[model samples]
Target: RLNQRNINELKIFVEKAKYYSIKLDAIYSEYTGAYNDIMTYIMTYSEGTSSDKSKVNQAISILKKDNKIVNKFKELEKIIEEYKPMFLSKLIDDFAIELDQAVDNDVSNARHVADSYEKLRKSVALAYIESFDVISSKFVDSKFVEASKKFVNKAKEFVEENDLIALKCIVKTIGDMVNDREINSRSRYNNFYKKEADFLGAAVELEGAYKAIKQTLL
Candidate 1:
């Protein structure tokens, strides 16, 4: 019972929504992967204080000797610099605020930086997981939702166990998820054609970074 004008407007709305949705997915995936990279670096360097304080100090000394902290800042800056003028401009002010609190606040030691960075990453991951979980249900494929949920849980396990070895495995899994050609080939893979290679590139970069940092520590 709709008029021609109403039908035409609905068509336009659907088309625009589809276009914007793809763009948003691309932005979200990149942002999540980039921030996760930062957190991984931060966590790799951090050593919490406890009865085994000497061991923590030893690890911190090694990180300092290799200039790991400064190098990580430079790496994170490069990632942020590329993103700031691009999709980040589309993000709300809250995103900037959270990042500032996490990465820019009092960062006296690797431990402090790691804690703050994890907080920021966790908040953003949870937000996106929830947002996309609903969106996937409504219009897009649910694969990304399932993937993201798995990552959040795995990240939490890393956070809880303070297990660097386990983190390496998680990083490998991330690379696998992004590089899975068969998964990417699915019609429900949401913007996979546009972003898959880029995501894979990021994964490769992270793996290289991890190996380089691990060499210095070992």
Candidate 2:
């Protein structure tokens, strides 16, 4: 027995929760994909199809473009800090000195920067899902739960081990899970656990991408 007001409040929370989830997903996908793109390109460049002069030039141009995109993504990341403000306040207050020392015009510094950037974005996305997972776990739509669970697990090992190659593999797993042709997020969201079987289907692309990268990197 629920009152109209209670139902309305529930609807609003659900909507806000979903909105936050989607926007977070949108940004996380872009952020992680940007890094993974750079890693894959770098790792595969020598073995890539550079035999044709024009193809080689095109690949070079694409790599440069991706570098620019990565820089821009980092810039956009600063702007997005407002959306998740509290997440960074402590890092600024607590680690400012240590972080400043990590900067230097050296190759090691460059790798350190790359690794930190990737880890920071990964941490933010993981924290958000960790928060949402608590709220959504009891819902009838277990698809969301399943998806978040998969993401958390994939992200967890990467964050803990700091193994770039394994992180790349997990990124592929996430990609596969989301883009399965036979199923989709919307279809699962609309139904109850009736769609539970299809929930895990989203991870196929992610898993396949993992295999493709792991074959080489791992």
State which candidate has the highest lDDT.
2
After best superposition, candidate 1 residue 179: deviation in angstroms? 2.3
Every candidate's CA RMSD: 16.9, 14.1
Candidate 2 clashing pairs, residues 3+ apart or interchain: 172-206, 173-206, 173-207, 176-205, 176-206, 177-202, 177-203, 177-206
TM-score of each: 0.28, 0.33
Off-target runs (Cα >4 Å) in candidate 1 are 1-68, 76-139, 181-218
Instruction: Report the poorest 10 consecutive residues by lDDT, candidate 1.
Output: 180-189
Per-residue lDDT of 66-125 in model 2, one digit per residue for the tens?
354344434433433323345544433332332344332232432344465555545544
Best model number under TM-score:
2
Candidate 2, poorest ten consecutive residues by summed lDDT: 1-10
Model 1 per-residue lDDT tens digits across residues 1-218: 21234223323432333322233334334344433434454455455421333433443343334443333333322333322222222232333333334422223343553444444333332332233223223322233334444444544444244322223333334434323312222222343334333333333443343334334434
